[PDB]
Coordinates of C-alpha atoms in Angstrom, one line a residue:
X26 CA 161.7 -85.1 -158.0
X27 CA 158.0 -84.2 -158.1
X28 CA 156.3 -80.9 -157.2
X29 CA 152.6 -80.7 -156.3
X30 CA 150.3 -78.4 -154.4
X31 CA 150.4 -78.6 -150.6
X32 CA 147.5 -80.5 -149.1
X33 CA 146.2 -80.3 -145.5
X34 CA 147.2 -83.9 -145.1
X35 CA 150.9 -82.9 -145.5
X36 CA 150.7 -80.8 -142.3
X37 CA 152.7 -83.3 -140.2
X38 CA 155.4 -83.4 -142.8
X39 CA 155.4 -79.6 -143.3
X40 CA 155.9 -79.2 -139.5
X41 CA 158.7 -81.8 -139.6
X42 CA 160.4 -79.9 -142.5
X43 CA 159.9 -76.7 -140.6
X44 CA 161.7 -78.1 -137.5
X45 CA 164.7 -79.2 -139.5
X46 CA 165.1 -75.9 -141.4
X47 CA 164.6 -73.5 -138.5
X48 CA 165.5 -73.3 -134.8
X49 CA 162.7 -73.2 -132.3
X50 CA 162.3 -69.3 -132.1
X51 CA 162.0 -69.0 -135.9
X52 CA 159.6 -71.9 -136.6
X53 CA 156.0 -71.4 -137.8
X54 CA 153.4 -73.1 -135.6
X55 CA 151.2 -75.9 -136.9
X56 CA 148.3 -73.4 -136.9
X57 CA 150.2 -70.9 -139.1
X58 CA 151.4 -73.7 -141.5
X59 CA 147.8 -74.8 -141.8
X60 CA 146.6 -71.2 -142.2
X61 CA 148.8 -70.7 -145.3
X62 CA 147.8 -73.9 -147.1
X63 CA 144.1 -73.4 -146.5
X64 CA 144.1 -69.7 -147.3
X65 CA 145.9 -69.9 -150.6
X66 CA 145.4 -73.6 -151.6
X67 CA 146.8 -73.2 -155.1
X68 CA 149.7 -71.0 -153.9
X69 CA 151.6 -73.6 -151.9
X70 CA 153.8 -76.4 -153.3
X71 CA 155.8 -79.3 -151.9
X72 CA 158.9 -80.9 -153.4
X73 CA 159.1 -84.7 -153.1
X74 CA 162.4 -86.6 -153.0
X75 CA 162.5 -90.3 -152.1
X76 CA 158.8 -90.0 -151.2
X77 CA 159.4 -87.3 -148.6
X78 CA 158.6 -83.6 -148.5
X79 CA 162.1 -82.1 -148.6
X80 CA 160.9 -78.8 -149.9
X81 CA 158.0 -76.5 -149.3
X82 CA 157.0 -73.0 -150.5
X83 CA 154.1 -70.9 -149.2
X84 CA 152.6 -67.8 -150.8
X85 CA 149.6 -65.5 -150.7
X86 CA 148.3 -62.9 -153.1
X87 CA 148.5 -59.3 -151.8
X88 CA 147.8 -55.9 -153.2
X89 CA 151.4 -55.0 -154.2
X90 CA 155.0 -54.5 -153.1
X91 CA 154.0 -51.4 -151.2
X92 CA 151.7 -53.4 -149.0
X93 CA 154.7 -54.7 -147.0
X94 CA 155.5 -51.3 -145.5
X95 CA 155.7 -51.6 -141.7
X96 CA 154.4 -55.2 -141.7
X97 CA 155.1 -57.6 -138.9
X98 CA 156.0 -61.3 -139.5
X99 CA 153.2 -62.6 -137.4
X100 CA 150.5 -60.2 -138.6
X101 CA 150.7 -61.1 -142.2
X102 CA 147.4 -62.8 -143.0
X103 CA 145.6 -59.4 -143.2
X104 CA 147.5 -58.5 -146.4
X105 CA 145.7 -61.2 -148.4
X106 CA 144.1 -59.7 -151.5
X107 CA 142.8 -62.3 -154.0
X108 CA 142.5 -59.5 -156.6
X109 CA 146.0 -58.2 -156.0
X110 CA 148.7 -57.8 -158.6
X111 CA 151.6 -59.3 -156.5
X112 CA 152.3 -62.7 -154.9
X113 CA 154.0 -62.6 -151.5
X114 CA 156.5 -65.4 -150.5
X115 CA 155.7 -66.4 -147.0
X116 CA 158.4 -69.1 -146.9
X117 CA 160.7 -71.4 -148.9
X118 CA 162.2 -74.3 -146.9
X119 CA 164.5 -77.0 -148.2
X120 CA 165.7 -79.8 -146.0
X121 CA 169.3 -79.2 -144.9
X122 CA 170.2 -82.8 -145.8
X123 CA 169.4 -82.2 -149.5
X124 CA 171.3 -78.9 -150.1
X125 CA 173.7 -80.4 -152.7
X126 CA 170.7 -81.1 -154.9
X127 CA 170.2 -77.3 -155.4
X128 CA 166.5 -77.9 -154.8
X129 CA 166.2 -74.3 -153.4
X130 CA 166.7 -72.7 -156.7
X131 CA 164.3 -75.2 -158.3
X132 CA 161.4 -74.2 -156.0
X133 CA 162.1 -70.5 -156.5
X134 CA 162.3 -70.7 -160.3
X135 CA 159.2 -72.9 -160.2
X136 CA 157.2 -70.3 -158.2
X137 CA 158.5 -67.5 -160.5
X138 CA 157.4 -69.5 -163.5
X139 CA 154.1 -70.4 -162.0
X140 CA 153.4 -66.8 -161.1
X141 CA 154.0 -65.6 -164.7
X142 CA 151.3 -68.0 -165.9
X143 CA 148.6 -66.6 -163.4
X144 CA 146.7 -63.6 -164.8
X145 CA 147.2 -60.4 -162.8
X146 CA 150.3 -61.3 -160.9
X147 CA 153.0 -58.7 -161.7
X148 CA 155.6 -59.3 -159.0
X149 CA 156.8 -62.0 -156.7
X150 CA 157.9 -60.3 -153.5
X151 CA 158.9 -61.3 -150.0
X152 CA 160.7 -60.3 -146.8
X153 CA 164.0 -62.1 -146.8
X154 CA 166.7 -62.1 -144.1
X155 CA 170.5 -62.3 -143.6
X156 CA 172.2 -65.5 -142.4
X157 CA 175.6 -64.1 -141.6
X158 CA 175.1 -60.5 -140.3
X159 CA 176.4 -61.0 -136.7
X160 CA 179.9 -61.6 -138.1
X161 CA 179.6 -58.2 -139.9
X162 CA 177.9 -56.5 -136.9
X163 CA 181.1 -57.3 -134.9
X164 CA 183.1 -55.5 -137.6
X165 CA 181.1 -52.3 -137.1
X166 CA 179.2 -52.7 -140.3
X167 CA 175.6 -51.5 -140.4
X168 CA 172.7 -53.7 -141.5
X169 CA 171.6 -51.4 -144.4
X170 CA 175.2 -51.2 -145.8
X171 CA 175.7 -55.0 -145.3
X172 CA 172.3 -55.7 -147.1
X173 CA 173.2 -53.4 -150.0
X174 CA 176.7 -54.9 -150.2
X175 CA 178.4 -51.6 -149.5
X176 CA 180.6 -53.3 -146.9
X177 CA 183.0 -54.6 -149.5
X178 CA 182.7 -58.3 -148.7
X179 CA 180.5 -60.8 -150.5
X180 CA 176.7 -60.6 -150.6
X181 CA 174.8 -62.5 -147.8
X182 CA 174.1 -66.1 -148.9
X183 CA 170.4 -65.9 -147.9
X184 CA 169.9 -62.6 -149.7
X185 CA 172.1 -63.6 -152.7
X186 CA 169.7 -66.4 -153.2
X187 CA 167.1 -63.9 -154.4
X188 CA 169.5 -61.3 -155.7
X189 CA 171.2 -64.1 -157.8
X190 CA 168.0 -65.0 -159.5
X191 CA 167.0 -61.4 -160.3
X192 CA 165.4 -59.9 -157.2
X193 CA 166.0 -56.2 -156.4
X194 CA 166.0 -55.0 -152.8
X195 CA 162.8 -53.0 -152.0
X196 CA 163.7 -51.7 -148.5
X197 CA 164.2 -52.7 -144.9
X198 CA 161.3 -53.3 -142.4
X199 CA 162.5 -52.3 -139.0
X200 CA 161.2 -54.6 -136.3
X201 CA 159.7 -56.9 -138.8
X202 CA 160.6 -60.1 -136.8
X203 CA 161.8 -59.1 -133.3
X204 CA 162.8 -62.7 -132.5
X205 CA 165.2 -62.7 -135.5
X206 CA 168.1 -61.3 -133.4
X207 CA 170.7 -62.2 -136.1
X208 CA 168.9 -59.6 -138.3
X209 CA 168.4 -57.1 -135.4
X210 CA 164.7 -57.8 -135.9
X211 CA 164.8 -56.3 -139.4
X212 CA 163.5 -57.7 -142.7
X213 CA 164.7 -57.1 -146.3
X214 CA 162.0 -56.7 -149.0
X215 CA 163.0 -58.5 -152.2
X216 CA 161.1 -58.0 -155.4
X217 CA 161.1 -60.4 -158.4
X218 CA 159.8 -58.4 -161.3
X219 CA 158.0 -60.6 -163.9
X220 CA 158.0 -58.5 -167.1

């Protein structure tokens, strides 16, 4: 394994990794993937396995956790605040063929460790999602109750990824990502406190 900063040359691999991790409606464009790496150059990392980019994390520095209120998924570049006290996770992709390596938790704990070494960063936040909500929507369960685990069943795997490491839920953004039908267009704010 080897983790390094993302470079504009990795764009073809970052798009290839994006296509394996997400279906067509949920894929970032080549322009957006380039927008992230060039806007926050020292805030994006790639994970190399067998000489290939099997993992990628994007992030930008914004004002704080409150800046995500009523934010759309596509209209996120405007939040960039280089003097802000919080680092926003724009994405964390791990190739589906390397899931048994637990590389996902490695990239997350790497970002959390790198953010605690940058002066001024107080929180690592992001707008997560639910991977198995439609099975609960058919049971009558609401999104907010399912997200907060008040339904009785186990926590959502995509949310439990951040909850398991130490993230607390910071709210739900209605209509955050209208093409994310499995989440009813919603988005869950997770907050990784650092101190």
